[PDB]
Design a protein around this ligand. Sequence first.
Ligand SMILES: *[C@@H]1O[C@H](CO)[C@@H](O[C@@H]2O[C@H](CO)[C@@H](O[C@@H]3O[C@H](CO[C@H]4O[C@H](CO[C@H]5O[C@H](CO)[C@@H](O)[C@H](O)[C@@H]5O)[C@@H](O)[C@H](O[C@H]5O[C@H](CO)[C@@H](O)[C@H](O)[C@@H]5O)[C@@H]4O)[C@@H](O)[C@H](O[C@H]4O[C@H](CO)[C@@H](O)[C@H](O)[C@@H]4O)[C@@H]3O)[C@H](O)[C@H]2NC(C)=O)[C@H](O)[C@H]1NC(C)=O
Ligand SMILES: *[C@@H]1O[C@H](CO)[C@@H](O[C@@H]2O[C@H](CO)[C@@H](O[C@@H]3O[C@H](CO[C@H]4O[C@H](CO[C@H]5O[C@H](CO)[C@@H](O)[C@H](O)[C@@H]5O)[C@@H](O)[C@H](O[C@H]5O[C@H](CO)[C@@H](O)[C@H](O)[C@@H]5O)[C@@H]4O)[C@@H](O)[C@H](O[C@H]4O[C@H](CO)[C@@H](O)[C@H](O)[C@@H]4O)[C@@H]3O)[C@H](O)[C@H]2NC(C)=O)[C@H](O)[C@H]1NC(C)=O
Ligand SMILES: *[C@@H]1O[C@H](CO)[C@@H](O[C@@H]2O[C@H](CO)[C@@H](O[C@@H]3O[C@H](CO)[C@@H](O)[C@H](O)[C@@H]3O)[C@H](O)[C@H]2NC(C)=O)[C@H](O)[C@H]1NC(C)=O
Ligand SMILES: *[C@@H]1O[C@H](CO)[C@@H](O[C@@H]2O[C@H](CO)[C@@H](O[C@@H]3O[C@H](CO)[C@@H](O)[C@H](O)[C@@H]3O)[C@H](O)[C@H]2NC(C)=O)[C@H](O)[C@H]1NC(C)=O
Ligand SMILES: *[C@@H]1O[C@H](CO)[C@@H](O[C@@H]2O[C@H](CO)[C@@H](O)[C@H](O)[C@H]2NC(C)=O)[C@H](O)[C@H]1NC(C)=O
Ligand SMILES: *[C@@H]1O[C@H](CO)[C@@H](O[C@@H]2O[C@H](CO)[C@@H](O)[C@H](O)[C@H]2NC(C)=O)[C@H](O)[C@H]1NC(C)=O
Lengths: 426, 426
Amino acid sequence: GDLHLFGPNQRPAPCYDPCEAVLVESIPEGLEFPNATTSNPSTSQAWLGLLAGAHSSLDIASFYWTLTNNDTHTQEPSAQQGEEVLQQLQALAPRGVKVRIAVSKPNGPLADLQSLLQSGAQVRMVDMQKLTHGVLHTKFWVVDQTHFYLGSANMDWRSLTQVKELGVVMYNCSCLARDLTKIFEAYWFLGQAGSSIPSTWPRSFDTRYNQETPMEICLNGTPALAYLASAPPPLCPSGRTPDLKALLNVVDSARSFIYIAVMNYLPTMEFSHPRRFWPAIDDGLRRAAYERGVKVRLLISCWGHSDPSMRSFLLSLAALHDNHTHSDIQVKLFVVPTDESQARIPYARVNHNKYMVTERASYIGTSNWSGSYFTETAGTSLLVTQNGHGGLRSQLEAVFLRDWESPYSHDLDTSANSVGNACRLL
Amino acid sequence: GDLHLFGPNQRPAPCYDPCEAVLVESIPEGLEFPNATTSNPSTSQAWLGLLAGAHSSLDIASFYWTLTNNDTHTQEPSAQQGEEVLQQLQALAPRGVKVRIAVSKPNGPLADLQSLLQSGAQVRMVDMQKLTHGVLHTKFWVVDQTHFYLGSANMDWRSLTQVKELGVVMYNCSCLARDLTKIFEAYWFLGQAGSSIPSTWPRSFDTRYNQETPMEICLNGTPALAYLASAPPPLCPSGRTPDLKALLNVVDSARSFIYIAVMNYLPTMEFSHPRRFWPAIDDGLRRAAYERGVKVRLLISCWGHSDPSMRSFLLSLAALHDNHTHSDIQVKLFVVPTDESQARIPYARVNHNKYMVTERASYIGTSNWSGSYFTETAGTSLLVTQNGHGGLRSQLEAVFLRDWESPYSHDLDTSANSVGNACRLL
Ligand SMILES: *[C@@H]1O[C@H](CO)[C@@H](O[C@@H]2O[C@H](CO)[C@@H](O[C@@H]3O[C@H](CO[C@H]4O[C@H](CO[C@H]5O[C@H](CO)[C@@H](O)[C@H](O)[C@@H]5O)[C@@H](O)[C@H](O[C@H]5O[C@H](CO)[C@@H](O)[C@H](O)[C@@H]5O)[C@@H]4O)[C@@H](O)[C@H](O[C@H]4O[C@H](CO)[C@@H](O)[C@H](O)[C@@H]4O)[C@@H]3O)[C@H](O)[C@H]2NC(C)=O)[C@H](O)[C@H]1NC(C)=O
Ligand SMILES: *[C@@H]1O[C@H](CO)[C@@H](O[C@@H]2O[C@H](CO)[C@@H](O[C@@H]3O[C@H](CO[C@H]4O[C@H](CO[C@H]5O[C@H](CO)[C@@H](O)[C@H](O)[C@@H]5O)[C@@H](O)[C@H](O[C@H]5O[C@H](CO)[C@@H](O)[C@H](O)[C@@H]5O)[C@@H]4O)[C@@H](O)[C@H](O[C@H]4O[C@H](CO)[C@@H](O)[C@H](O)[C@@H]4O)[C@@H]3O)[C@H](O)[C@H]2NC(C)=O)[C@H](O)[C@H]1NC(C)=O
Ligand SMILES: *[C@@H]1O[C@H](CO)[C@@H](O[C@@H]2O[C@H](CO)[C@@H](O[C@@H]3O[C@H](CO)[C@@H](O)[C@H](O)[C@@H]3O)[C@H](O)[C@H]2NC(C)=O)[C@H](O)[C@H]1NC(C)=O
Ligand SMILES: *[C@@H]1O[C@H](CO)[C@@H](O[C@@H]2O[C@H](CO)[C@@H](O[C@@H]3O[C@H](CO)[C@@H](O)[C@H](O)[C@@H]3O)[C@H](O)[C@H]2NC(C)=O)[C@H](O)[C@H]1NC(C)=O
Ligand SMILES: *[C@@H]1O[C@H](CO)[C@@H](O[C@@H]2O[C@H](CO)[C@@H](O)[C@H](O)[C@H]2NC(C)=O)[C@H](O)[C@H]1NC(C)=O
Ligand SMILES: *[C@@H]1O[C@H](CO)[C@@H](O[C@@H]2O[C@H](CO)[C@@H](O)[C@H](O)[C@H]2NC(C)=O)[C@H](O)[C@H]1NC(C)=O
């Protein structure tokens, strides 16, 4: 944008930091992938490295904190890592790292946050129920205004060893890190006593990097376009792309395929006691498949707490796979096998990833794909497009294909006894 | 509306004519209904009565004209009635009835219209392809600015004896007849040479009777609210409700059930070589069923010319019938059995009705339920609401239930050999 080649459409300044993105996964204890020719760093080790390198600041947006066995009233070896994480966190403030933690208003005092407060970290509880009827569901870390983690892993030891998670760590990308810090600051401001959402956020929260003018970055030595989308709409300044709009733009721009892996997919306002039908994403997928022959693959997690009403809706989508329409939509259920010893571990053994990948773009989110997460509840997503054929997009596609062809993915007609865990959708 | 009880919302003048509505059906030769405790007058006899009583004027909006065996290159007794109809039509102008006939631009000279032109009737061909990319699909009669027929029957002898049709004749309702004449006049104006759709139609085309302020009429001695909706949008003045909006208002207002019988149902722009997904009606039905527990019954016709791609979409809707959601959507295929002697009759033996009925309202249309009919192609619908529990609404519900429970309606898993006719959807 030069004001003479494009007029008032000034393209914002490019970023010259040597950004590098790493996919990070939590693979629960017991899951093996025969082929998986490559593996990604675990969430635990990425988090520990970030904490070890931290020297100035750490901001965490979080849903809940259960990093210790005491938190879950259990006694499991596999909890170590969360505890280790907690330990390292408590070492940040004493050595001079400014720590700020925004957490959804809990239903009672939390041990980890009290210990971190005693260590010198700042903690604020955000009551999103009173503001938007949603919750602070976002999970991300910003380190030294230079690195950040965005993904599905909660501040939960299970998230490291007993729950499958996917996310991304962006290193040496200070521009994007500061951009994410703007969202964090929205949370931080709302975490005070008596604060309300402004009708128009101050300019310090606004951003020039969005769907229309994404940030130009050097990702792994190659040019790429990236931006961060936010939810809910009342928390988005005018320049910040809403999460739903970013997701649907990725869906509508796909010309070859759309692979989606999300723990829950529901074309409804799950909540809102007067229930509401919510076909935004569903209609986007139907549109892609019908109009542009896009092959749609939907990998939905299933465990004992899954909403059974999901099944019908998924079946509805699956019904569009037809010879005459040339529409190609397939649905599979990803189940995490459980042992009798793992069955005592409360609320674990489920695939928690929330991401989508096409032939042109990558979308990594914190939200499940139901209406509330995009209208009332807090969430963030990273969107990256890179003109090459390798890169982070290819890594995401490989992860999805590995999970899709793995024996843990089953069709909707599969028997409930052949999946290795409780599945209300089968 | 009194300007002091409701402000600028002035309710238009009520109609004091003794309006009486009669459901009229074409039941093809060979279809019998064991119970059907009541029967409706045939389309042929209603049309013949209207022609016999006509003394001042007749306006016909039409799609095509094949009223004679010569037109279809056949020799069938069951054609008589169309021919009889044609005969009576030719008697109108010689005895002083002003006849105006608007017809979609045909692909060659039409015999019936040439004969009627020689009889003294005015005929105009409307080229909707050049104006909106659609066709003049509307079928209705206005008689003496007092009566009118609105329904699915074309100016085709088959429509009387070999194709199932549903429609309504409104007698002694001059207010509504003149209102319909306004739509006809839109067609008549566009039927000239070199005319184009005005950006704003002159006031003579506008109407005060619409969804917001329906006409108050005395229907069969009881108060009722009625209005006429029109398609496509470019042909609607500001006061005229578009057909799609009227249909969707009936769908969204239903609290108990929605019964729909339409020859074709497709959530797509069937046409528009770059194909388009079109979920307006589909989403409305999903919304009704999910949010308000409305029981949805979809009776779709199936014959040798049916679009096979319908099946998948219907199955998609049918997939929402689930115990957990409490959603109740059912789909059946209505097939007209054919004989070897009827098989020579070209383009016949199919259910042609286009109507919807709820527990509160009646909708009778000229259009199949696909996108083009509501965006580019000409169509009209009559909407009636009556606070009582009998009336025209109950008659429509009885007709639908008769057709639904009849042996001619089959589920989507039925074998193609058990329906009595070619069915591409089975
Ligand atoms: C953009 O740039 C960034 C930055 O340059 C780049 O990020 C790198 O991405 C690559 C590819 O994904 C990463 O390399 C992979 O790392 C995987 C994880 O390695 C870590 O974890 C290993 C597992 O440790 C646990 O389990 C073992 C079990 O045996 C146990 O002992 C441990 O205690 C622990 O519990 C760990 O072994 C590993 O440490 C070894 O490897 C590192 C290499 O970084 C080395 O420095 C160490 O000294 C040590 O030797 C590390 O801690 C890893 O699994 C994976 O291995 C795959 O390939 C091999 C070879 O074929 C297979 O045999 C194997 O089965 C796996 O399939 C691979 O090495 C790399 O770590 C990232 N770098 C950073 C800083 O994160 C992006 O990829 C770039 N993007 C693009 C598009 O190019
Ligand atoms: C609002 O007001 C309007 C106006 O008042 C009102 O409209 C009336 O609605 C009623 C109910 O729908 C109509 O009455 C029905 O009419 C049916 C059709 O009747 C016509 O067609 C008959 C069939 O003729 C063909 O087939 C026979 C086969 O045997 C053949 O001979 C013929 O040649 C032809 O091919 C025909 O027989 C009939 O003529 C008889 O009946 C009329 C009555 O109008 C009488 O005047 C004649 O002299 C002659 O006797 C007529 O031409 C009819 O099928 C139906 O019958 C049902 O009920 C009987 C009794 O139970 C059953 O035995 C039978 O099997 C059927 O189930 C019934 O009679 C009436 O015609 C409408 N009036 C007008 C002017 O259209 C609305 O209903 C009102 N709305 C509300 C909500 O109240
Ligand atoms: C979970 O809760 C239990 C029970 O409250 C905690 O147990 C505590 O564990 C610590 C060490 O893990 C014990 O402290 C130890 O004291 C000895 C005394 O000499 C000292 O030498 C050691 O170096 C260590 O500091 C502590 O006594 C013990 N408390 C009880 C009541 O048994 C446990 O620490 C909690 N875990 C987490 C992660 O919070
Ligand atoms: C369909 O096409 C055929 C062939 O063109 C038409 O046949 C015509 O039928 C009419 C009567 O139905 C015949 O007219 C008759 O002429 C005698 C002559 O004395 C007269 O006495 C009768 O009263 C009657 O008017 C006409 O000759 C005949 N033409 C041919 C070539 O056989 C038929 O009329 C067409 N049907 C329709 C509905 O248009
Ligand atoms: C991010 O930036 C740091 C600092 O420049 C990089 O750390 C260097 O890494 C190379 C290769 O591993 C070493 O040879 C240098 O000695 C490191 N420098 C310092 C100051 O530590 C780091 O590699 C970059 N990328 C990531 C993913 O951290
Ligand atoms: C519509 O109006 C006409 C004219 O008022 C009605 O015709 C009358 O019908 C009654 C009962 O059938 C007869 O007793 C009268 O002699 C008729 N009058 C005339 C002038 O014909 C007619 O019934 C009304 N309804 C319909 C459906 O036509």
